[PDB]
Design a binder for this molecule. Structure first.
Ligand code: ZN
Ligand code: ZN
Ligand code: ZN
Ligand code: ZN
Lengths: 629, 629
């Protein structure tokens, strides 16, 4: 059968264990998540211009009764219900947030003559919906300043729903961001982007229903709104360690925290309200040092130290602390404790992973050895909803020591699909493997079962009995998972094994991409077969941005060098970056650009075309839980 | 049996394949490695002050006949013999190197009144031995300037064998280094240092004999000299993109290449000789993006681009190119080709790994899919002696996507020792596993055998038959390995499985360590059991360096904050950094320091002691190829 199964007796026992181990009697977050509520609109439905649905919360109604469901980790279900506390909220005098209109919060700070807005959600429709809620309840006021707390799409993505380029060009609207914003906003999502995006369908459970045996929450929010990604460049950057500014009468201190949750990030202190906005450094969950979709590993040490810096600068005077995800904390003592514990949470994960590692504990072992001490374990905002202790400890270890466990048995490993046949033969064949796996399954050993049955799936990807048992065990692991990404991953893997994989660009984002990175990405697109034995060089001049690049294709590799031209280039191309962007977005033809006097050439006029024709594409729905089709 | 076996028929066939695939007819390196030879001292033996042996080459005599040995990859044996071309060499007029006195080269550039020296080898005795060779052959001249090409111990480690602090303090001797030198010199070897050091015994094959069935070479040199590590701080730093200086009459251009082979590194162009010293950016081998001992992953993209920058700045005029490992290349056309190919080598590894990854190829697969194109494959300096294509492709992938293959079967893996019993049971028990493994072994399937028998070793680490078969298969893989680190690793793993693991600090290095890092490392040493439930804070003042730190132990985590003091610290300690260093090196007692007026306290005088008593140690010889003892 290819539908979700009930929680097994072992999964039920594991949920009961969670209830026995975690302080469910501490219900204060429920009072925190409702504090200062102005308006929870009855039934949220946000639509995009093209008529698609950006966001809705109706699929979560199953959670509203608060009745325990054994196909959901009870700690996750707690978080799931808390993230359902949406609407417009007062945080402190003249400080409001709209929560639950998207993954992140949007923050409205009352200036003398209009709003200062922190962050803008993921897509313009949710930002616009949020601003309309604000206007209906608090009165319409112009937005004078948008601040990006950090360079993530769930923060800058909805900006055009709030402001238009004309307002920025006139100086009617300022956009403030931490230094390094533009570099970080685009960079990490590019070179490995297709891999990340596809792996992200698992993390986000994009093919799962909302329900008790599908997607229930995304830890830092319910989920990510769907729609166009927008991005408007900052007009002012917060440099160095930070800056004090006054915006529309309101004093702001920005504290840069480069290289924590994002390469470009800053906390915001508001001395008049004694309000401390901890960007995404401190949220209602342990965050990712490594996000499973795939990314660079984050620096827990810097993260801890920047939280400590904020603690000693502001925490020591804060009356309310709030963030760009989840709900605020009020009370200086509570704030001081949350700051210390989150500081020590990242500090501990970092230091104790390395302590274990220096004892010889490997990347393959550390998650089964490292445990938070009670003082850190027993806080809800320390729980592994978004990041997990498990995968973060492996991440620290990977950061310092890399992927290889130091055991040469694993140094030159056969691909899973090339060793799988022999695993299966050594275990007595598929039928025998399944027999033994089913007995294991019957003992609740799902972490083992998914390991060993995965071998048979990789040996025999059409073996329907193997896929369905693998799926069953993964699903129990999903039910069991406190971590929303782990849950979604497990259930998505079960979905694809049971059903198969599906068989049916942002202009702003491209505009924000550095030219060197763009050509780095084209070099990633290069088909090595097509490039072999070729050599060509092209001077590229982009006059609107006053940049020249030398492009050199040689030895099946595309090079680009900023600020260099070669007298020996076969071709020299002059084209505005804006027009190159249109070209790569298919919004204009190369021929038309030439006719408009927008794409110019000397030398061999064919080389750039030849280079473009060597560029391959990537299919999105690549296989994950079986070998390639 | 517990001694090395002959190469098997399959290993013999694999060596013959190497000979068929690689351009052994291209012997020019042999003429390159001998070019400009002034003196090869007959029998090199370098001794440390304490009477230990720093370095000798006599153990390599087996290689001198040049006779093929089937227990050595023939491509590696070629490299092994070339790295034996030691002694004093002329590179170009007034430019000399001593090669083969240590892992790296030391370079002597004739100034008007003395030497400018680039790098200093690993330990003072080898540097001193090298300088004596130079003085005997070329005449003694004072060293006026030492330049560190980059922040690695095989480059700065032998500095006290050349110069003394007094000469630096008087301005008699300048030390020039790339900006970021001091930060990088110590940093990466610290927090994960014990793990790295122990894993390094495998990479370096420190327990292997020199011989055909042990250690034969270390790719970028024969091996690493043994002895005290010294480090003297630079007196002048090369800032920004680089600088042009004149040293003792000789013009130098330094080209910073931060974040390639090292975070702090620079190439050196010598316009008078048209000599281009490519630091360790370009050496006679593919280098590591990830060094198996364990380290941060290096940036192949920046590495490629910095090589391209050097190509277009200098390569275009160079007459000789040489490096801090291996031998020079002469001839502008040859230099241009080596620069392009090395640029495209790192570029290709980077771009094609990501191309494959964006197609869904995982970290567990990519090394079995990615292959260099012939133009890059067929050069000796592109061969995987030091880095390997295999482990570097996985490294690129790990850098962008992390350790996790995206398949949730592998998301929450049991430790090898916790799943091993079940692998063994599913395969019919130890005796049955061994039977099937031996049949596989007999078919030459060593990469499979080491995978599956490793399971039995982890289930039954005292199973002598399992250990010996595992060892046998690993050893054949070692014989087969072109990569010196892979070879050494495989043979070391075979050594420890057959024999077991052994059952029986640098003042300069500690001095060079930032105070924050030092306390970061103490926090790594913290025993979490001892720390639990404790809280203490200490203001630490270090007046010789004019630095204050706030130390806070809470929630089983030690925090330190630079430039902060707390009115609520339980204790305030004032101590010179120099004296703290002595204390941690056990060169002085805390009591004596107090008596000398060197360690001062107010508040609770017990806290610092309490904090120190919570600090654990790490045993060096942890298990790698079996579960912990
Ligand atoms: Zn973020
Ligand atoms: Zn966010
Ligand atoms: Zn180096
Ligand atoms: Zn080196």
């Amino acid at each position: 059968t290819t539908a979700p199964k009930p929680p097994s007796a072992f999964t039920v026992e594991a949920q009961r264990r969670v209830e026995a181990e975690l302080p469910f009697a501490d219900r204060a977050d429920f009072e925190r998540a409702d504090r200062g509520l102005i308006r929870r609109p009855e039934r949220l439905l946000i639509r995009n211009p093209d008529g698609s649905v950006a966001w809705q919360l109706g699929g979560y109604d199953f959670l509203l009764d608060g009745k325990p469901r054994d196909s959901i980790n009870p700690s996750l279900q707690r978080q799931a219900l808390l993230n359902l506390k949406y609407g417009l909220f007062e945080v402190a005098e003249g400080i409001y947030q709209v929560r639950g209109f998207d993954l992140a919060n949007i923050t409205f700070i009352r200036g003398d003559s209009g709003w200062i807005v922190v962050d803008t959600l993921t897509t313009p429709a949710t930002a616009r919906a949020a601003y309309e809620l604000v206007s209906r309840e608090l009165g319409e006021r112009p937005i004078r300043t948008v601040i990006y707390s950090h360079a993530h799409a769930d923060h800058f993505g909805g900006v055009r729903g709030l402001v238009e380029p004309q307002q920025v060009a006139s100086g009617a609207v300022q956009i403030i961001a931490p230094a390094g914003f533009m570099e970080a906003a685009i960079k990490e999502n590019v070179l490995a982007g297709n891999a990340m995006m596809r792996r992200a369908t698992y993390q986000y459970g994009t093919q799962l229903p909302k329900g008790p045996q599908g997607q229930v929450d995304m830890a830092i929010g319910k989920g990510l709104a769907r729609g166009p990604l927008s991005l408007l460049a900052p007009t002012r950057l917060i440099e160095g360690e930070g800056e004090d500014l006054v915006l529309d009468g309101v004093p702001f201190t920005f504290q840069n925290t480069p290289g924590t949750e994002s390469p470009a990030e800053m906390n915001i202190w508001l001395p008049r309200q004694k309000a401390l906005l901890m960007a995404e450094n401190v949220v209602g969950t342990l965050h990712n040092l490594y996000t499973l979709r795939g990314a660079e590993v984050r620096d827990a040490l810097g993260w801890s130290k920047y939280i400590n810096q904020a603690l000693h600068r502001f925490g020591r005077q804060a009356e309310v602390m709030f963030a760009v995800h989840n709900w605020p904390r009020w009370g200086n003592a509570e704030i001081v404790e949350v700051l210390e514990k989150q500081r020590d949470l990242y500090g501990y994960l970092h230091d104790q992973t390395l302590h274990l590692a220096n004892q010889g504990v490997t990347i393959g072992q550390v998650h089964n050895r490292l445990r938070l001490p009670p003082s850190l374990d027993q806080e809800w905002y320390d729980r592994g909803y978004h990041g997990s202790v498990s995968h973060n400890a492996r991440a620290v270890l990977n950061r310092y020591l890399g992927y290889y466990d130091g055991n040469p048995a694993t140094l030159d490993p056969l691909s899973p699909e090339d060793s799988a046949g022999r695993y299966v033969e050594y275990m007595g064949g598929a039928e025998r493997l399944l027999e033994q796996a089913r007995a294991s399954y019957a003992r609740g050993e799902y972490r083992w079962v998914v390991e060993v049955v995965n071998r048979l799936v990789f040996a025999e990807p059409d073996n329907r009995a193997a896929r369905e048992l693998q799926a069953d065990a993964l699903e129990q692991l999903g039910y069991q998972a406190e971590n929303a990404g782990w849950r979604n991953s497990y259930l998505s893997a079960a979905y694809e094994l049971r059903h198969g994989v599906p068989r049916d660009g942002s202009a702003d984002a491209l505009a924000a991409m550095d030219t060197g990175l763009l050509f780095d990405y084209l070099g990633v697109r290069l088909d090595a077969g097509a490039a072999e034995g070729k050599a060509l060089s092209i001077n590229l001049r982009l006059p609107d941005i006053g940049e020249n690049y030398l492009l050199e294709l040689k030895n099946s590799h595309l090079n680009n060098l900023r600020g260099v031209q070669s007298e020996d280039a076969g071709q020299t191309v002059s084209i505005d970056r804006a027009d190159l962007n249109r070209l790569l977005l298919k919004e204009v033809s190369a021929v038309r650009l030439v006719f408009e006097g927008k794409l110019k050439s000397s030398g061999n006029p064919l080389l750039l075309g030849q280079l473009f024709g060597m560029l391959g594409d990537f299919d999105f729905w690549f296989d994950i839980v079986t070998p390639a089709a």
